[PDB]
Amino acid sequence: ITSVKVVTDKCTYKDNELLTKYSYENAVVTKTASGRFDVTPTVQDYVFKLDLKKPEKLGIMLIGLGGNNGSTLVASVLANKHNVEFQTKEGVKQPNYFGSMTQCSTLKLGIDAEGNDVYAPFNSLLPMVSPNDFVVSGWDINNADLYEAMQRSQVLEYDLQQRLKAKMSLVKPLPSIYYPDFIAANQDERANNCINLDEKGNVTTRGKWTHLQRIRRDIQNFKEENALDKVIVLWTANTERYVEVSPGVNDTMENLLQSIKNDHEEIAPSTIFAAASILEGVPYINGSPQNTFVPGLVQLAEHEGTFIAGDDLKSGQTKLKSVLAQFLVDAGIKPVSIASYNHLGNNDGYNLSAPKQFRSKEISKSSVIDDIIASNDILYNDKLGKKVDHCIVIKYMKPVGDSKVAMDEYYSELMLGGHNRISIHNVCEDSLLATPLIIDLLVMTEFCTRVSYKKVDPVKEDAGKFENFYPVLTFLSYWLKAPLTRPGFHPVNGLNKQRTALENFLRLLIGLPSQNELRFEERLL
Amino acid sequence: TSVKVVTDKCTYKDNELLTKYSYENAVVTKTASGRFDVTPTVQDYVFKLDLKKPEKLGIMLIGLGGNNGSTLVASVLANKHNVEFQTKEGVKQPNYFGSMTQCSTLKLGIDAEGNDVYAPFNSLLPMVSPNDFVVSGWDINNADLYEAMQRSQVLEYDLQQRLKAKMSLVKPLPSIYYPDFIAANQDERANNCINLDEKGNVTTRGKWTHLQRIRRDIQNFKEENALDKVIVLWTANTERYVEVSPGVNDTMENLLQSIKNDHEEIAPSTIFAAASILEGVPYINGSPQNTFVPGLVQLAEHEGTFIAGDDLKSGQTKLKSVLAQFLVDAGIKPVSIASYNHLGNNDGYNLSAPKQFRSKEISKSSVIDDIIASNDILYNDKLGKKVDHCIVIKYMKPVGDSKVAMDEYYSELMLGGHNRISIHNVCEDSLLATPLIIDLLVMTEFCTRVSYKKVDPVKEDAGKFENFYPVLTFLSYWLKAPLTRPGFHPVNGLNKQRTALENFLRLLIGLPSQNELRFEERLL
Amino acid sequence: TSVKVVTDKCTYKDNELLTKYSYENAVVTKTASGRFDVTPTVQDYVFKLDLKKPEKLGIMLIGLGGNNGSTLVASVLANKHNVEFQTKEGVKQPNYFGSMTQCSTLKLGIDAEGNDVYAPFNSLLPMVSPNDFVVSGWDINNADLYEAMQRSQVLEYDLQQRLKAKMSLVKPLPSIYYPDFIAANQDERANNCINLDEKGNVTTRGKWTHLQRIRRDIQNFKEENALDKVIVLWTANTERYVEVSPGVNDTMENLLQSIKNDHEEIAPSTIFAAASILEGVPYINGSPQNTFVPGLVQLAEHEGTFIAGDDLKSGQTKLKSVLAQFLVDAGIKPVSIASYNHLGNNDGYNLSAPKQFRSKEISKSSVIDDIIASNDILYNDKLGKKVDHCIVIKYMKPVGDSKVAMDEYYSELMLGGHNRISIHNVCEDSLLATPLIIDLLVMTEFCTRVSYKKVDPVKEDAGKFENFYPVLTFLSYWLKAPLTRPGFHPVNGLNKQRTALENFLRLLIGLPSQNELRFEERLL
Numbered sequence A: 001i002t003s004v005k006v007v008t009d010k011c012t013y014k015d016n017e018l019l020t021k022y023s024y025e026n027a028v029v030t031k032t033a034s035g036r037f038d039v040t041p042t043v044q045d046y047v048f049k050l051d052l053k054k055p056e057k058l059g060i061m062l063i064g065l066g067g068n069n070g071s072t073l074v075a076s077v078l079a080n081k082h083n084v085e086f087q088t089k090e091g092v093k094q095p096n097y098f099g100s101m102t103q104c105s106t107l108k109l110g111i112d113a114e115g116n117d118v119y120a121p122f123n124s125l126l127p128m129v130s131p132n133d134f135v136v137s138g139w140d141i142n143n144a145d146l147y148e149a150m151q152r153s154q155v156l157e158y159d160l161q162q163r164l165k166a167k168m169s170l171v172k173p174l175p176s177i178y179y180p181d182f183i184a185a186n187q188d189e190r191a192n193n194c195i196n197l198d199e200k201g202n203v204t205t206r207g208k209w210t211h212l213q214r215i216r217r218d219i220q221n222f223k224e225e226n227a228l229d230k231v232i233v234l235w236t237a238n239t240e241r242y243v244e245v246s247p248g249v250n251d252t253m254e255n256l257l258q259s260i261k262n263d264h265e266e267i268a269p270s271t272i273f274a275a276a277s278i279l280e281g282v283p284y285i286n287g288s289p290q291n292t293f294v295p296g297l298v299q300l301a302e303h304e305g306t307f308i309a310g311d312d313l314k315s316g317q318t319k320l321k322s323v324l325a326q327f328l329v330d331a332g333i334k335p336v337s338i339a340s341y342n343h344l345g346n347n348d349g350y351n352l353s354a355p356k357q358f359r360s361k362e363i364s365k366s367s368v369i370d371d372i373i374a375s376n377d378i379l380y381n382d383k384l385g386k387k388v389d390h391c392i393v394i395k396y397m398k399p400v401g402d403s404k405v406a407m408d409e410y411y412s413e414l415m416l417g418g419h420n421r422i423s424i425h426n427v428c429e430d431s432l433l434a435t436p437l438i439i440d441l442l443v444m445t446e447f448c449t450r451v452s453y454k455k456v457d458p459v460k461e462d463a464g465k466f467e468n469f470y471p472v473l474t475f476l477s478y479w480l481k482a483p484l485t486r487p488g489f490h491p492v493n494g495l496n497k498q499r500t501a502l503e504n505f506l507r508l509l510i511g512l513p514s515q516n517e518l519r520f521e522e523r524l525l
Numbered sequence B, C: 001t002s003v004k005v006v007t008d009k010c011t012y013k014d015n016e017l018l019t020k021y022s023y024e025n026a027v028v029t030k031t032a033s034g035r036f037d038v039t040p041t042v043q044d045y046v047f048k049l050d051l052k053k054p055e056k057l058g059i060m061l062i063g064l065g066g067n068n069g070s071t072l073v074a075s076v077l078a079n080k081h082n083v084e085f086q087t088k089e090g091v092k093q094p095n096y097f098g099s100m101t102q103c104s105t106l107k108l109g110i111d112a113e114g115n116d117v118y119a120p121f122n123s124l125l126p127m128v129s130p131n132d133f134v135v136s137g138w139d140i141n142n143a144d145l146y147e148a149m150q151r152s153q154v155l156e157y158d159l160q161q162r163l164k165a166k167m168s169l170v171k172p173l174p175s176i177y178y179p180d181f182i183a184a185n186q187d188e189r190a191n192n193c194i195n196l197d198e199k200g201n202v203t204t205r206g207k208w209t210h211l212q213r214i215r216r217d218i219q220n221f222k223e224e225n226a227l228d229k230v231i232v233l234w235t236a237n238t239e240r241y242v243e244v245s246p247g248v249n250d251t252m253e254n255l256l257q258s259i260k261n262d263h264e265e266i267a268p269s270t271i272f273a274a275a276s277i278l279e280g281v282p283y284i285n286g287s288p289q290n291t292f293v294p295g296l297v298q299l300a301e302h303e304g305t306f307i308a309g310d311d312l313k314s315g316q317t318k319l320k321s322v323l324a325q326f327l328v329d330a331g332i333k334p335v336s337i338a339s340y341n342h343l344g345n346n347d348g349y350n351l352s353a354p355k356q357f358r359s360k361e362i363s364k365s366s367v368i369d370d371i372i373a374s375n376d377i378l379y380n381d382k383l384g385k386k387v388d389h390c391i392v393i394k395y396m397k398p399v400g401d402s403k404v405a406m407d408e409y410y411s412e413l414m415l416g417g418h419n420r421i422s423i424h425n426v427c428e429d430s431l432l433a434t435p436l437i438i439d440l441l442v443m444t445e446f447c448t449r450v451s452y453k454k455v456d457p458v459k460e461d462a463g464k465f466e467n468f469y470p471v472l473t474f475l476s477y478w479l480k481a482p483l484t485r486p487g488f489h490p491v492n493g494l495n496k497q498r499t500a501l502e503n504f505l506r507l508l509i510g511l512p513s514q515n516e517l518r519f520e521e522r523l524l
Ligand SMILES: NC(=O)C1=CN([C@@H]2O[C@H](COP(=O)(O)OP(=O)(O)OC[C@H]3O[C@@H](n4cnc5c(N)ncnc54)[C@H](O)[C@@H]3O)[C@@H](O)[C@H]2O)C=CC1
Pocket: A063, A064, A065, A066, A067, A068, A069, A070, A139, A140, A141, A142, A176, A177, A178, A179, A183, A190, A235, A236, A237, A238, A239, A269, A287, A288, A289, A312, A313, A315, A346, A347, A348, A351, A402, A429, A430, A431, A432, A434
C-alpha cells in the first residue's frame, strides 16, 4: 500500500472528510482591432470536500454486458481479484490492468534531495475504488453467459478463458430492451433476451414507460442482492442511430418523460437506460457515439442532480491522432490533410458496417480537427486557407477478429513549399484498450461522486453551502471521443490537456499547485 | 498583435519590466513503507526584462554553407522581401511554417462565453523577428550561398532562381579544419581554412591564432554591419567527442592554456565556443559532440555569457518522445522501440563515419530511461524494468535531404495482449531544422534581455539582479542532448519542455501557469 | 490425386520412367554496332526417374533443438497424427501452409472450355510426404524437443500441450562445438558436445574422431530405425566464414588431411558435411557460412552425393527480389532500396555478433546487381548504373520469433517523378522457415531418384546415365546465396527459380514448358 502525505495548512481532516482550500486563477480576454489582447486575471476561491470513505464494493451495471468489452471487463476484474495466472506461448503471465490510466500511470509529486523528479501512482494521492472491488452485472439483448461471451469475442488467451470458465459461465446478462429501428438490421438474431415482449410473438416498442419502470427495479434488485450502496451504469452496447432532437418530444424534462410514456419513436433504448439511472440517482456513462443525452434528458439529470458523461469511448487510435495533430500544430506545422482508415472483424465493426451507426462514429470526430484549427489563426485564416481535409473509413473485415488495424495519414505544409508526410499504423485487439478505459471511467466517476465544493468569499469570512459537480462530468473528457458539454462551452479535445486537468485536480485536493515545469532550482540559483 | 495584462505584479520602469513571481514546487521523501511525504516550497523572485530589442540581430553560423545554413539565409531573405514563387501547385507565398516562435499560438485565457482565446506566441513580450537577422558565418567550403542552395537541393528550383542575385553575394568566411575531428571524407570539401602553415597546408599548430582570428571575424562583422548584438550557432558537421581530462580541459585556465599549447583535445568546436564567450557573444551548439567540456562552462560563467546545446532536436525524435510518453501516461508498457532511418545529404554522409554517428547515439537515449524511470508501476524488478531500443541511420544518397524515418513500438497490453504501433515519417529535414534554428536564435536573444533576483518575505534587498545560469536549459525543447548543471537530470519530454516556455513567458507578464481545470464550466 | 500424360516421350520400364526431352536454348554475341546475333542450340537428353520412393525418409537436423528444428518435428507429428488444437479462434486442423511442395498447385493445361486446370504440385511424380519423415539430429544443447518448443515460443500453447508426450521423448544427439566459430554468447548453451578432451573440456583437438563419431551417428540412426534413405540438413546457428586456402581446404585431399591435422579452418559445418558425403547422405546447408569450400565440393562429386545451399531464403528476402523485379520489368528504375529488420530469437541473438551477421550480408546482394545487370536501358554510364541498398538486422528480444521486416524502395519515374514503395512484414519467421525446410528435403529426395544422359541425333549410345551435378541449383528458390559451379552466375529471381521446377517436373512427364500464349483464345 502506497500513499502520500502533503504537509500543508490548506487541508484539514474531519470525520473522514478532507476539506481543502484552493484558489482558482484564470483570466478573461478581449481583443483590440489593432490586435491588442486585453487580459484581466480572475480569481475564485473555493473550499473542496472529499468524502474519504470509499464504498467497499462498487456495483457496475453494463448495457452490452455480453459484448467484447463487457465480457473482457468481467474477465479482467475476476482475473486480477483472484490472481489467475494463465499460460501463453511466452509463458505463464500474471494478470494486470495495463492500459488503465487510474491503475497503471504515475504522476509527478515533486522533486527529491537532488533536483530529481519523484513520481507516484495516480491512484495513490487520494482514495480510489479499486477495480478488484467491482461487482458487475448488466443487461444484453442476448442470453449468452459470459463464458460463451468470452468464447465468441475471441479477445483473451485460450488458457485464460479455460481458467475463468467455471466462474464466467455463471454470469448471465439480464434481459434488455431491443428496439429494432435503432441499430444495424443485422443484430436481429442475437436479440433473444428482451423484456419488451408483447402477448407472444414478442418484440414491440409499445410500453416504453413500463420498460423504464423495469430498468429502475433492475437497478434496485441488483443493489440489495449484493448488499451494495453505490452503483454506476455504463453503456457499451452496439452504436445506435442518432435520434432527431425536436421541440416537444425530448427538448425538455417534461417533454421527454412524456414522449416516453407516449412511446415516441425518438425515445431510444439508451434514452430509457439513461432516464432510469438518473431517476434512481445512479451515474450513467455513454460509451457509444449516438446522442443519447438530448436536452430533455440533460435537464432531468440537472433536476435530479446526477452524474452523466460520455459520447463514445475514446479510442487509442483517435486519441493518438489528437496527440499527433496538436504536437504538429504547436510546432507551427500545418496539417492540410488527415486520412483515417480502419478495419476490424468483431460485432462492433459488423454493426458499424451500416451507414446509420457509422454516421454516429463519423459525427464524433466532426469537431476535433476543428478545435486544433481554431487555436492557430497564424496557420489557419482566410488568407492561407483554413481547412484541413479529412476522412474516416471503417470497414468490416471478419478474418481479423477483434483486431483493429488502424492507419492514418498526415500530409502537412512545411516552410517554403516543402511538405511532410507522416503515417501511423496501429494494430491491436481493440477491446483490450477499451476495457482499461472503461475501468478508468467507472473508477473516476465514483471518485467524483464523493467530491463536493463551496465558493468562498474573501470579505465575508465564510459563505456558500457544499454542492456537487455540474451533472455533466467533462472531467472524463480524456476518455470520450465526443466530450459532451454545457450549452455555452465549446468541446476541448486535447488529449494531454484533459489529463493535465485531472492531475491538477487531484493535486489541488491534497494542497499542491498546478505543475509548472519551470524547474528554477536548476535553471537559476 | 500585442498583449496587455492588468496585474500589480508588473511595473514598467525606464524601458525595463519588473515582474514579481512566486515559485511553488515541492520536496518529497519516500518511507520504504510506501508513503511519500510532501513538503511544498516557495521562492519569490523578481525578473527584469530589458524591453529594448536590437532592431537588427546578427547571426553568425559555423557551417554557413550547408543545407541548414543555406536554407536559413534563404528563408530570412524570402520572407523579409516577400519573395513569392512558382510551383506545380501555383504561386506560393513564403512563411516560417515549422517555427514555434513565428507560427504557433498560446492560450491567454477565456473570453466571455468561456471559450479559449489564443495569441501569437511571439506577441506577449517583444521578440526579434528573423526578418531582421543579418547573417554571416564560416564554412570550410567557399562556395557562395547561391551554389550552396544548389548543392543542397532543398529548395524549390524557381525560388532558388528568384534568390539567386541576392544569395550569390553571400560567401562563407574561412574556418577552422582539424581533419582528424570529422569524417575523413570531408577532406576534399575543405577549400576555405584559416589554419594554414607557412607553406600553404592546413595545420593544427597555432590554435590560439585561430582562436584570435575568430574573435577578429566576430568584431569585424559587428563593426562592418554596425550591430551590437550578435549570436553564434554551430550547424556544421558533427565532430567526434573529445575526451574530458584533468588539467587540459577541466577548467577555464587549463583549457585556455591547452588551446595555447595546441593540445589534441581542442576541437574546432571548442575554439569557436571559446572565441564567442571571450566576446560575450552567446554560443548555441547545434550538433552532438561534447563542445561544452567543464573548462568551457566556467569561462561562460565568468564572462557572464550564454551557451546552450548538444544536437538539434531532430524532430523525428520529437514525435518519438511524445508518442512514447503518451503510452506511458495511458498505463501502456512499451517493451521495445526500434528506430530506423536514412537520408542522402552531407549530414548523412558525414554521419556514415561511426565516430560522428556515435555522437547522435548518446546525445539521444536518456529519454527511454526517464520515461521508464517515472513509472515503476510498469517498470520494476518483478515485471522487468527495461525497454529494448536501437538507433540506426544509414546514408542512402538517392533520397537527398529527404530523411525517411521509421519507428516501431511493440507494447504490452492487459491480460497477454500486445499493441504494435509504427510511425513512418518522410520530409526534407532541413526544412525542419531551419525553423528550429530560427526558434532558437529568437529565444536565445530574448533570454538575453532577462535577468532575475531571488527575493525574501520580510528581509529582501541589497538588490542585484543576476543573469540566467550560463546553460540555457529553457532551449531543451529544440536540442536532443539538453546540456545541464551537474547531478541534475536531463529530462526531455518535449510537451513539458514546451509548458516551461509558455509558463515563463506567462509569468513575465504576471499570468499564473495554465491548469486546465475549467471551473467556470465544471463547477456550477 | 494423380497425373497421367499420353506422350511417347515416356516409357515405364521396370519401376523406372525413361523420358526423352529436347533442350532448346541460344547463344548470343553482341556486335558493338548494337546487334545481337542469336544462334539457337539443342541438346537431347534422357532422364531416368526411379519411381520407388523410400516409404520412410530419415531427416537428420544439425540444430535439432531450435526454433526451426523444433517446429519441423512438431509439424511432422501434428500433421501425421492429425492433432487438432485449441485457439482463441476455435479448433484448428494442422496443415503444411507455406510449403510449396505440399500446398501450392501447377497449371497442367486447359479443359474443354479453355479454362486453366491446376493440380497439386506434388501430384505429378511421386514424392515423399513430410508425414513420413523420421527425425533425429544433433544440438549443442540437450534439451528435449518439448522443452525446445517451450523455449522457442513459436507454437500455440495448447498445441504445445497436445504434443508434449510425444515431443518430450525426442532428444538431440550431442554435437561438435568449436566456440570460436560462433557468437561467444552461445557458450553457456553448449551442454551436449562430443568433442571433449580427456579432462572433460570441449576441445578442438581430435577433429577426425569427431568426423567419425558423426558417421557412426548417421549409421546407427539408419540401423536403429531400419531406413536406407537419410538426408542431413544444417539449421544450426550461422558460423562465420572460414578462409579458403591452398593446400588446406582447396581439394578433397587437402581438406581430408586438414581435418586429420586439426586445422583452424575446419568448422563444425565442414565436419558434418564431410561425414555426410562419406556416407552418401545428401547434405543441405541451410545457413550463410561458406561450408562448401572447393575441397568439399570435390568429395561430393567423387562420391556421387548431393550438396545444396547457403542460407534459407529468408522469405522477406523473397518478396523483395520479386518486388524489385516487377519494377525493373515495368521500365521502373529503383535507385535505392533500404532493408531493415529485427526479431528476438536465438537466431537474432547469434547474428547480433557482426562476424555471423557478415554471412547474411553477402549470402544476400548478388540480386540487386543481377536486376541492374539485366537492364542497361535503365542502368548504364550515362544515367548511372547503381542502386544504393543496405541490410540491417538488430536483435530486439521482446518480439520473440517475430521478425519485423521493413523495406523501402525509392524509384525514378518519367520526367522527374518518383515513386516510394514500402513493404512492412510481420510473421514468426520459423513458421516460414519450417515449410521451406520440408520443401527442400522433399525436393532433395526427388532429385535423388533422377538421373540423365546426354543423347545424340544419329549416333547416341554407349548408354550410361549420370547423376545431377553434386550442386543442386534446382533448390535456389529456397536458399539466399545459391551455390553454383565456377564462373557461372548465381541468378536469383524467385519466380524464374520457380518456373524451373515446374518445367522440370513437367518435362519428366513429357509436357513442354508453359508459354502463356493462349492461342485457342487469342487466335480465331
Ligand atoms: N469492441 C471493442 O473492442 C471497442 C468498442 N468500443 C464501443 O463500445 C460499444 C460496443 O463495443 P463492443 O463491446 O465491442 O461491441 P459488441 O457489439 O461486441 O457488444 C455490444 C453488446 O451490446 C448488446 N446490445 C446491443 N443492443 C443492446 C441493447 N438495447 N441492450 C443491451 N445490450 C445491447 C449486443 O448484444 C452485444 O452483446 C460500441 O458501441 C463502441 O462505442 C470502442 C472501442 C473499442
